Ligand binder design. Structure first.
Ligand SMILES: N#CCC(=O)N1CCC(Cc2ccccc2)CC1
Ligand SMILES: [Cl-]
Ligand SMILES: [Cl-]
Ligand SMILES: [Cl-]
Ligand SMILES: [Cl-]
Ligand SMILES: [Cl-]
Ligand SMILES: [Mg+2]
Length: 344
């Protein structure tokens, strides 16, 4: 057990191992930047807020820790350390998580339009991380520019996985929290799968090429109209797959529209980028290109290396179907904290 020291930082008591120095607030939980004397990295340290205050909150704490312990990929957020000052389960109350310090997201780098070579490299890295995530049967569910960390060398990491249901008010109105969401999940058309993340990549790619949000709807229905104007109204094949009869009825109330010509929307763009966008932004989620397929698309010929695009170890999510008490979720979390093995 390392030696811990205490300090108060913006109305919060922090107790951390001596290896972490020069703590400075940067902003669920509270987050500080620090210097890790063991590895030489600048790191981000997150102290969880009220991790075991309800059943829902205890299960969410366990969910996040299981996920972060599993993700080991250059283009995905990973765990450098996890610790608690408690010396036993009976006194266990706080959880701290440590990862690399990531001070900028895709927004801060990019209302701006990038060169085609930058777009190739950034989207390639998102898809390389997604092939890894999807290989473990994980769905991110909330891909958007603010959830993509980028550094000075244009290197990218995916973070802030969907860990809980978003509130109804969070998704209301003219908000970027909804603009990158696949239509089938935005309107609850059907049981969704990993293809929802590819829709989000297409929205992000279009915005990097044009400098403009692709579907900036003022509400759910205005956004659906923007989407159907570009990709066309559904035919009977897709309508049958929409399980809600009321959502089916609404769609059939709309005047039919053909798919638009994407070369006349993304004027001047690389024709290979135009082709890839057509394969991502397909209304029927069964027919969208997968991450593994997209990495082999000719747009990425300068970066694609099939021997350097790894998959993940399998990931057991059976706990999601389990109903447990607060103290049981808390004891599972304690076990995962003390069994952590740091990376090389
Ligand atoms: N500067 C700044 C922000 C920053 O460095 N990033 C965004 C916030 C996350 C928080 C976090 C920490 C540990 C485990 C999971 C999540 C860290 C990376
Ligand atoms: Cl230490
Ligand atoms: Cl990381
Ligand atoms: Cl504690
Ligand atoms: Cl965003
Ligand atoms: Cl597992
Ligand atoms: Mg975020």
């Amino acid at each position: 057990r390392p030696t811990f020291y205490r300090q108060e930082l913006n109305k919060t008591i922090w107790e951390v191992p001596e290896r972490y120095q020069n703590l400075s607030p940067v902003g669920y939980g509270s987050v500080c930047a620090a210097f890790d004397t063991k590895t030489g990295h600048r790191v981000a340290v997150k102290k969880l807020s009220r991790p075991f205050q309800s059943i829902i909150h205890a299960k969410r704490t366990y969910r996040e820790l299981r996920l972060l312990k599993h993700m080991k990929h250059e283009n995905v957020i990973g765990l450098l350390d996890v610790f608690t000052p408690a010396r036993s389960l009976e006194e266990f109350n706080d959880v701290y998580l440590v990862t690399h310090l990531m001070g900028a997201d895709l927004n801060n780098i990019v209302c701006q339009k990038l060169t085609d070579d930058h777009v190739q490299f950034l989207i390639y890295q998102i898809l390389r991380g997604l092939k890894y995530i999807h290989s473990a049967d994980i769905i991110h569910r909330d891909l958007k520019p603010s959830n993509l960390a980028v550094n000075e060398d244009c290197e990218l990491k995916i973070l802030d996985f969907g860990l809980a249901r978003h509130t109804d008010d969070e998704m209301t109105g003219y908000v970027a929290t909804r603009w990158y969401r696949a239509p089938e999940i935005m309107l609850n058309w059907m049981h969704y799968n990993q293809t929802v993340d590819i829709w989000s990549v297409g929205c992000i790619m279009a915005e990097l090429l044009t400098g403009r949000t692709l579907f900036p709807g003022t509400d759910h229905i205005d956004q659906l109209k923007l989407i159907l104007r570009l990709v066309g109204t559904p035919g009977a094949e897709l309508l049958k797959k929409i399980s809600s009869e009321s959502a089916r009825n609404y769609i059939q109330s709309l005047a039919q529209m053909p798919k638009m010509n994407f070369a006349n929307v993304f004027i001047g763009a690389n024709p290979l980028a135009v082709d890839l966008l057509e394969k991502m932004l397909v209304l029927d989620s069964d027919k969208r290109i997968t991450a593994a397929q997209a990495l082999a698309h000719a747009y990425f010929a300068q970066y694609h290396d099939p021997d350097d695009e790894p998959v993940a170890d399998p990931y057991d999510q059976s706990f999601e179907s389990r109903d447990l008490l607060i103290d049981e979720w808390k004891s599972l979390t304690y076990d995962e904290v003390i069994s952590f093995v740091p990376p090389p």
